[PDB]
């Protein structure tokens, strides 16, 4: 469903670069040349709400899309002294489904390098806010007896005595309904709580309050049971209404081809062999490559 902040795509279409409903553009910069691919071609860089995009600005087909849940390090490099003005450069390190890429972005015209700052800022806002768009078990949600609300979140329905049909004897627990996510704590050792976001929900039906996950947190079917079913169907219908009105415009809580092969961070390596034990060092070491030895790789 949502891939803009979960993958890293190359030669993306002119439509997938367009702002998703919940997405929103923040800052832009022209003439940002792309490097780590020596095409020597200019472009335009965009720091959106969920991902960073770069399109060639002359052949807008060739482009890059990097999600914020797939970046590890972002480094700004101020160099290239007096000969001209102090120009910056952006080094982004990315790891998607165990494959490490690195992209470099060179600001050609030294007259507008401010972009490289705001990105950093929003990236923090992307990581400090993951309870908005991700699924978590047994977190630190509950205060003394109440829920700790996110910034853009207020409770809708406050129901006591809501069971959980995934355990045996620690069930009876409160059920908080909010505009961003729905949570349930256990009211007895209140660290068995589940915080499901509307973004991860696929369909709320009955078989009993069955909630399915959207192929990202796996097929996690959650079952709850309440007092006589009047309030039950009431809660189900209001939950479906809130789900649809959210999916209309997502929130995301962010406050404020061979293309891949030319962007590997390792260098001609998209792999990680099976980590096996090492009797030489005593550490878990990556498997050695068909004849190589540790004391032969170490020396020069």
């Amino acid at each position: 469903a949502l891939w803009e902040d979960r993958d890293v795509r190359f030669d993306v279409s002119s439509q997938q670069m367009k702002t998703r409903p919940g997405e929103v553009l923040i800052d832009c910069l022209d003439s940002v040349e792309d490097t780590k691919g020596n095409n020597g071609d200019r472009g335009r860089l965009l720091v959106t709400n969920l991902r960073i995009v770069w399109h060639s600005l002359a052949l807008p087909r060739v482009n890059l899309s990097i999600g914020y849940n797939c970046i590890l390090n972002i480094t700004t490099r101020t160099a290239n002294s007096k000969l001209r003005g102090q120009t910056e450069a952006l080094y982004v390190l990315t790891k998607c489904n165990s494959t490490r890429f690195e992209f470099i972005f060179t600001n050609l015209v030294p007259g507008s390098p401010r972009l490289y700052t705001s990105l950093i800022a929003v990236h923090r806002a992307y990581e400090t806010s993951k309870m908005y768009r991700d699924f978590k078990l047994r977190s630190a949600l509950i205060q003394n007896k109440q829920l700790r609300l996110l910034p853009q979140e207020n409770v809708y329905n406050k129901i006591n005595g809501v069971w959980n049909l995934s355990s045996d004897q620690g069930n009876l627990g409160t059920f908080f309904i909010t505009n961003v996510r729905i949570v349930w704590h256990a009211n007895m050792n209140d660290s068995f709580n589940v915080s499901i976001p509307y973004l991860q929900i696929r369909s709320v039906k009955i078989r009993a309050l069955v909630i399915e996950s959207s192929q990202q947190s796996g097929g996690y079917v959650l079952g709850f049971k309440i007092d006589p079913v009047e309030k039950l169907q009431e809660s189900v219908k209001e939950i479906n209404s809130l789900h649809k009105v959210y999916s209309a415009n997502p929130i995301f809580g962010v406050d404020y081809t061979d293309a891949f092969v030319a962007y590997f961070a390792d260098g001609n390596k998209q792999q990680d062999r099976e980590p096996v034990f090492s009797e030489e060092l005593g550490l878990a070491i990556e498997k050695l490559k068909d004849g190589f030895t540790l004391q032969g790789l170490w020396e020069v």
Partner: protein, 50 residues
């Protein structure tokens, strides 16, 4: 005490043109020369025959 070699004087401005290629501005220099009067270095005095 000694009189200057010439009364003329120069005045030079060095400025910069901010350009897209070099925002820091390409440096240019232009000058103008003024002419000072004898009334600054001389006075009417007595003449001698030889």
């Amino acid at each position: 005490s000694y009189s200057p070699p010439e009364l003329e004087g120069n005045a030079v401005v060095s400025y910069s043109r901010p350009t897209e290629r070099n925002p820091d501005g390409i440096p240019r220099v232009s000058q103008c020369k003024f002419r000072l009067p004898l009334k600054l270095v001389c006075l009417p005095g007595q003449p001698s025959k030889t």
